[PDB]
Each structure stands twice: as structure tokens, then as C-alpha cells.
Amino acid sequence: TEANPSNLNEDDARYGFRCCHLKNIWSAPLPPETKLAEEMGIESNSIDIMGLQAAYAQLHTEQERTYFMQRYRDVISSFGGSTSYDADNRPLLVMHTDFWASGYDVDGTDQSSLGQFSGRVQQTFKHSVPRFFVPEHGVMMTLA
Amino acid sequence: TEANPSNLNEDDARYGFRCCHLKNIWSAPLPPETKLAEEMGIESNSIDIMGLQAAYAQLHTEQERTYFMQRYRDVISSFGGSTSYDADNRPLLVMHTDFWASGYDVDGTDQSSLGQFSGRVQQTFKHSVPRFFVPEHGVMMTLA
């Protein structure tokens, strides 16, 4: 929530924010506040089995939310409904491309560099956005 | 309007005159003397709406001229007429070619140059003038 580009720090402002590593077991853990146990109160000597039933149901709603419905839009999708991008002010994703960056090695050829190599990665790529209709004034930003 | 090659300065005489950068917003501005307002006198308390009408018309001729008819030949074209190249003594353009100059990179291969590159631009090109009839003695100059 920085208010001005001037509230950003050296690195961020010049290179952009940092993003998440590709997903793996250690970089895609369940949200840190994930419940590991759900307590349910009980009268000194008895337990309301009907309440216990509700308790679970309630928990279920809580979990679903924590695990994958943390964003309003996703909760509404949960019900089988939908939301315009104006509903939560989300930028509209118009096109997403992804590709691997490969290249070649350069062979060292002098007395000491003979048998050495330097990797030069150089990948060509196309990123094409199909004719899009702009309903209101604004910006079309493309990032990498 | 230099009179003799000897009136030219070091750089010009050896390398040729300088030309305009490719056209862009900052290198193709409307001629510096472009009108930003056109005044029209008016009697102390009234304005001749008929004059105002003429005033605009007159302005229009002035603008058209400033914007794109600064050369005699272009004004005459404006009327849907034409002018020989002898009319304003303009050199006759016989052929105009244009192309991009690309090349390749040379890979550095020794201990310190390994992983370095040097751009060698080398472009082949054809410039062909179709059989032209020379009506009077003169010169056929080709420049780049």
C-alpha cells in the first residue's frame, strides 16, 4: 500500500516488486494461519452432538475460505455467481504469455581459456494481445 | 547559401551538410512561427461579423501556407495546377531508395573477452535508376 513512488525503496522503485518463487512444497505452504485444530466447547459432562455437527459445517466454511477463497471475487464464484472487474477494482488481465529462455555456449579458444565455456542465453518471443475493446479511459500495461 | 566550397566549414565540407532527425514529436514541430492566436480589430463597441468571417478565411490561407505550402511549387499544387522543375530551379529527383542496415555479432573467445560481443553491421543493397532521358547538359548526382 505505498502511497507515492517516493515511498518505495531503492530496489523496488527501480526494478519492480518481488514476486513469489515458482510453486513447490516449501514456497507454496498453506497460508500461515491455517487451522491445525478447531476447538468446541462442551458442558462439564455432556456434548451436544447436534452442535458438533454444526461446528464442523462452520469449520468447513472457514477452511474453504482460508485455503482458496480469501478474495471476495473467489467467494462469490464459490456460489456459482460472478463479479465484474469493477466489483473489487481488479485490473483486467488481457493476455498472459509464458516461455523458457534458452541460448548457447561460447567456446573459449586461447591458451588458458581453451576448454572453457560461457553461457549466452538469447530467446526470441511473441506476445500478442487480440483486439480488445476499451470501455473507459485508462492504461494498457504490459509487464514481464 | 554558401558561395564557394571554401565558405564551408571543416565538418560540412568534408562530410556533407547535416539533415533532420527522423520525424517524431520533438523533431517535427510545426514551424516555429506558427500562429497561436489571430487578432482582429474591432470598433470600440461593435464587431463586424462579416469581417470576422473574412478574417477567418484570410487566416486559413495563412495557415495552409505555414503548415504545408511554404514552397512556391506546393502552393501551385494547392490550386490543382503544376510546375516544371525549371520553375523554381529544383533538382529533379530521379530515384529514392531506403533500407535498414543490419549485420551480426562477433563472439569474444579469450580468457577475458569470453562472453563479450562486438557488433559488425554489414548490409548489401541495390539502388537502381530506370533509363532516364537527359533533356539538357548537366549532372546526375547520387547521395547517401
Curated annotation (Swiss-Prot), chains A, B:
It comes from the Viruses. It is found in: Virion. Pentamerizes and interacts with H protein, G and B pentamers to form 12S pre-assembly complex. By binding with protein D, induces joining of twelve 12S complex to form the procapsid. The procapsid has an external scaffold made of 240 copies of protein D, 60 copies of the internally located B protein, and contains 60 copies of each of the viral structural proteins F and G. Upon genome packaging, interacts with protein J. The mature virion is composed of 60 copies each of the F, G, and J proteins, and 12 copies of the H protein. Assembles to form an icosahedral capsid with a T=1 symmetry, about 30 nm in diameter, and consisting of 60 capsid proteins F. Upon virus binding to host cell, one of the spikes dissociates from the capsid and the virus interacts with LPS through the exposed EF loops on the F proteins. After the genome had been ejected, the channel formed by the F proteins at the unique fivefold axis remains open. Belongs to the microviridae F protein family. This is Capsid protein F. The chain holds residues 145 to 288 of 431 of the full protein.
